[PDB]
Motif scaffolding. Structure first.
Motif, PDB file in Angstrom:
ATOM      1  N   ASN A  73      -7.515   6.227   5.567  1.00 42.32           N
ATOM      2  CA  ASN A  73      -7.113   5.601   6.486  1.00 42.32           C
ATOM      3  C   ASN A  73      -5.712   5.383   7.110  1.00 42.32           C
ATOM      4  OD1 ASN A  73      -8.823   3.966   4.630  1.00 42.32           O
ATOM      5  ND2 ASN A  73      -9.130   2.346   5.972  1.00 42.32           N
ATOM      6  N   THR A  74      -5.536   5.748   8.333  1.00 41.19           N
ATOM      7  CA  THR A  74      -4.141   6.175   8.987  1.00 41.19           C
ATOM      8  C   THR A  74      -3.727   5.179   9.865  1.00 41.19           C
ATOM      9  OG1 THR A  74      -5.133   8.432   8.956  1.00 41.19           O
ATOM     10  CG2 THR A  74      -2.970   8.228   9.676  1.00 41.19           C
ATOM     11  N   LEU A  75      -2.532   4.462   9.741  1.00 38.85           N
ATOM     12  CA  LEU A  75      -1.861   3.539  10.481  1.00 38.85           C
ATOM     13  C   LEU A  75      -0.978   4.391  11.506  1.00 38.85           C
ATOM     14  CD1 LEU A  75      -0.489   0.000   9.632  1.00 38.85           C
ATOM     15  CD2 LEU A  75       0.207   1.141  11.633  1.00 38.85           C
ATOM     16  N   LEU A  98      -1.093   8.450   5.980  1.00 37.96           N
ATOM     17  CA  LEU A  98      -2.560   7.865   5.314  1.00 37.96           C
ATOM     18  C   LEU A  98      -2.218   6.714   4.380  1.00 37.96           C
ATOM     19  CD1 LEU A  98      -5.306   8.162   3.739  1.00 37.96           C
ATOM     20  CD2 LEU A  98      -5.203   9.475   5.700  1.00 37.96           C
ATOM     21  N   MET A  99      -3.287   5.865   4.294  1.00 41.67           N
ATOM     22  CA  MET A  99      -2.826   4.534   3.493  1.00 41.67           C
ATOM     23  C   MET A  99      -3.802   4.586   2.004  1.00 41.67           C
ATOM     24  SD  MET A  99      -3.842   0.902   5.006  1.00 41.67           S
ATOM     25  CE  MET A  99      -2.697   1.070   6.246  1.00 41.67           C
ATOM     26  N   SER A 100      -4.766   5.493   1.988  1.00 42.16           N
ATOM     27  CA  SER A 100      -5.261   5.655   0.605  1.00 42.16           C
ATOM     28  C   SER A 100      -6.205   6.830   0.804  1.00 42.16           C
ATOM     29  CB  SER A 100      -6.110   4.550   0.232  1.00 42.16           C
ATOM     30  OG  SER A 100      -6.557   4.551  -0.925  1.00 42.16           O
ATOM     31  N   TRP A 149       1.870   4.997   1.073  1.00 47.87           N
ATOM     32  CA  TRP A 149       1.363   5.691   2.295  1.00 47.87           C
ATOM     33  C   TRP A 149       1.796   7.451   2.015  1.00 47.87           C
ATOM     34  CZ3 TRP A 149       2.248   2.873   7.717  1.00 47.87           C
ATOM     35  CH2 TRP A 149       1.901   1.769   7.643  1.00 47.87           C
ATOM     36  N   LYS A 202       0.859  -1.016   0.153  1.00 43.58           N
ATOM     37  CA  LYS A 202      -0.037   0.077  -0.070  1.00 43.58           C
ATOM     38  C   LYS A 202       1.038   1.334   0.027  1.00 43.58           C
ATOM     39  CE  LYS A 202      -3.338  -2.377   2.912  1.00 43.58           C
ATOM     40  NZ  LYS A 202      -4.196  -2.698   2.028  1.00 43.58           N
ATOM     41  N   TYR A 206      -5.905  -4.078  10.750  1.00 43.25           N
ATOM     42  CA  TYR A 206      -6.645  -3.989   9.330  1.00 43.25           C
ATOM     43  C   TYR A 206      -6.862  -5.450   8.855  1.00 43.25           C
ATOM     44  CZ  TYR A 206      -7.837  -2.492   4.779  1.00 43.25           C
ATOM     45  OH  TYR A 206      -8.443  -1.731   3.737  1.00 43.25           O
ATOM     46  N   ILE A 230      -5.034   1.045  13.198  1.00 44.40           N
ATOM     47  CA  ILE A 230      -5.692   1.820  12.159  1.00 44.40           C
ATOM     48  C   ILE A 230      -6.689   2.573  12.591  1.00 44.40           C
ATOM     49  CG2 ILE A 230      -6.886   1.656   9.980  1.00 44.40           C
ATOM     50  CD1 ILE A 230      -4.036   0.367   9.834  1.00 44.40           C
ATOM     51  N   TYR A 231      -6.327   4.135  12.093  1.00 43.03           N
ATOM     52  CA  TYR A 231      -7.358   5.006  12.702  1.00 43.03           C
ATOM     53  C   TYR A 231      -7.783   5.889  11.367  1.00 43.03           C
ATOM     54  CZ  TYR A 231      -5.176   5.182  17.201  1.00 43.03           C
ATOM     55  OH  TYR A 231      -4.648   4.754  18.817  1.00 43.03           O
ATOM     56  N   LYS A 232      -9.032   5.888  11.107  1.00 39.44           N
ATOM     57  CA  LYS A 232      -9.717   6.606  10.128  1.00 39.44           C
ATOM     58  C   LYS A 232      -9.374   8.040   9.834  1.00 39.44           C
ATOM     59  CE  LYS A 232     -14.000   5.385   8.904  1.00 39.44           C
ATOM     60  NZ  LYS A 232     -15.483   5.219   9.107  1.00 39.44           N
TER      61      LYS A 232
END
Length: 179
Positions: free
Chosen positions: A98-100, A93-95, A45, A43, A156, A121-123
């Motif tokens: 979504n935030t790891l 941010l993952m996409s 980031w 993914k 996740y 994971i935090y939205k």
């Protein structure tokens, strides 16, 4: 060298010994924080928000974590204010949203207390900070670091194969891969 724009290698060439060399050649300071997460999630980031609870590392850091790359990190406490080790949260941010978030914690004194790290994971909504983890018993559970390694899913879906080495100078060697 300091302002180098290419001090990173593939998430396979690095090793715990190179990491030891990383904090070793990072000033003759009492405490040394070294991190190297082998991200093989697949993914892309992008740094969304990063803030430390006590210590620090840098005011601004890279905003890209592609597949097959180890995320290098290093810190040396706040120094300016009172006596405090290295505690902080990094969030990418993952996409789309979504935030790891990864937690780091270490006291500026040798005793019973140990290192603490927690990945989750935090939205992508509302900036994470002290008030986000505190007060509510929802996101206040960091893992105690100790010389070893263990696998477990981050949340996740993928699982992190690694751990955090204590013994004063801390190094995080966690390899995230599919569960």
């Amino acid at each position: 060298s300091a302002d180098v724009a290419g001090a990173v290698i593939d998430g396979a060439s690095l090793s715990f010994d190179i990491l030891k060399t990383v904090l070793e050649a990072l000033g003759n300071v009492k405490r040394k924080i070294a991190v190297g997460v082998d991200n093989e999630s697949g993914k892309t980031w992008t740094a969304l928000n990063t803030y430390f609870r006590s210590g620090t590392s840098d005011i601004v850091l890279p905003h890209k974590v592609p597949h097959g790359k180890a995320l290098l990190y290093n810190g040396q406490k706040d120094r300016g204010p009172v006596a405090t080790g290295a505690v902080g949260v990094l969030a990418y941010l993952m996409s789309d949203g979504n935030t790891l978030a990864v937690l780091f914690s270490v006291p500026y004194d040798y005793n019973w207390y140990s290192n603490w790290w927690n990945v989750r994971i935090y939205k992508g909504k509302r900036r994470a900070d002290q008030r986000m983890y505190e007060e509510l018993y929802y996101n206040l559970s960091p893992f105690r670091g100790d010389n070893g390694w263990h696998t477990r899913n981050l949340g996740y879906g993928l699982k992190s194969r690694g751990f955090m080495n204590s013994s004063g100078h801390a190094i995080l060697e966690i390899h995230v891969t599919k569960a």
